[PDB]
């Protein structure tokens, strides 16, 4: 969990502004939008990186390029790549970061409106964020379904296949015969209906409050739609914050006068924010339990 600053530049003052806005609006709440940057510190191997064991196992299995592992047509022709990825990435093999535990502290102080995540690791929930406050915009392993007829399966029958040497005879539907897979959104599928429904409600809520709210976008390249449409859809008069090593998406393309950009690691941003809020003592208890 140990962190350091990204460069010699200090971000403490920028982070201070965030704290002063929450101190001045004490009954207000924050919406978070987060991606794979917040789980890097957990040791999750990036399937697109040649430095990982995951990458080289997928190449050896003849995956044509990384993102095919999450492609419907590919999985139906050959499920082995996706099953080998699931074995390495399956929830419960990793532990939540300091940033993950900040979401849980915000919820404990009653200042979390929602977290929208494009990660499939389920580390927000593992850290104790409640079910009503999370939207897993790209699904998770906690449900499974038949890709052909939609019949529902418990996630254990898929999981038990990952323990076999070698992995073979993939799970097939007892009604229609097609492959059953986890409820992970693949490239070319629509996202779950709760995504569009909750953003509709949270977009209304944000407009009505203009207790002024805050939206903080953390560790995401804003390269995958429709997720990445959310920050352009934030009301002009609700203050946006970006904690990301690089300036991306609508914050690069259409900057706003009140946009605040913080180039910092998510874990280091967490530790600075908690310090500027005065919540060091309650944080330290969450971290030791």
């Amino acid at each position: 969990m140990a962190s350091m600053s990204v460069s010699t530049a200090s971000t403490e003052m920028s982070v201070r502004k965030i704290a002063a806005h929450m101190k001045s609006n004490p009954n207000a709440k924050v919406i978070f939008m987060v991606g794979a940057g917040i789980s890097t510190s957990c040791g999750i191997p990036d399937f697109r990186s040649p430095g990982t064991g995951l990458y080289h196992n997928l190449a050896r299995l003849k995956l044509p390029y990384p993102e095919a592992v999450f492609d419907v047509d590919f999985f139906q022709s050959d499920p082995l790549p996706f099953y080998t990825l699931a074995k390495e990435l399956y929830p419960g093999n990793f532990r939540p970061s300091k940033f993950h535990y900040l979401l849980k502290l915000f919820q404990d102080k009653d200042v979390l409106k929602r977290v929208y995540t494009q990660n499939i690791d389920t580390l927000e929930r593992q850290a104790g964020v409640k079910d009503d406050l999370i939207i897993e915009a790209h699904g998770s392993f906690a449900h499974c379904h038949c890709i052909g007829c939609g019949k529902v399966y418990p996630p254990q029958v898929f999981k038990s296949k990952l323990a076999e040497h070698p992995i073979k005879d993939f799970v097939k539907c007892d009604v229609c015969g097609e492959l059953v897979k986890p409820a992970i959104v693949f490239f070319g599928e629509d996202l779950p209906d709760s995504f569009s429904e909750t953003w509709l409600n949270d977009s209304e809520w944000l407009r009505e409050k203009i207790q002024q709210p805050l939206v903080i976008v953390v560790g995401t390249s804003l390269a995958v739609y429709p997720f990445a449409s959310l920050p352009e859809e934030i009301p002009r008069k609700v203050k946006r914050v970006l904690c990301n090593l690089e300036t991306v998406g609508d914050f690069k393309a259409n900057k706003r006068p009140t946009d605040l950009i913080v180039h910092q690691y998510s874990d280091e941003f967490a530790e600075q924010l908690v310090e500027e809020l005065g919540w060091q003592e309650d944080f330290e208890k969450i971290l030791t339990a």
């Binding site: 490239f187 995504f195 390269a223 995958v224 429709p226």
Partner: peptide
Amino acid sequence: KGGAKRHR
């Protein structure tokens, strides 16, 4: 609703 998961 946004459409299917994709890039761009």
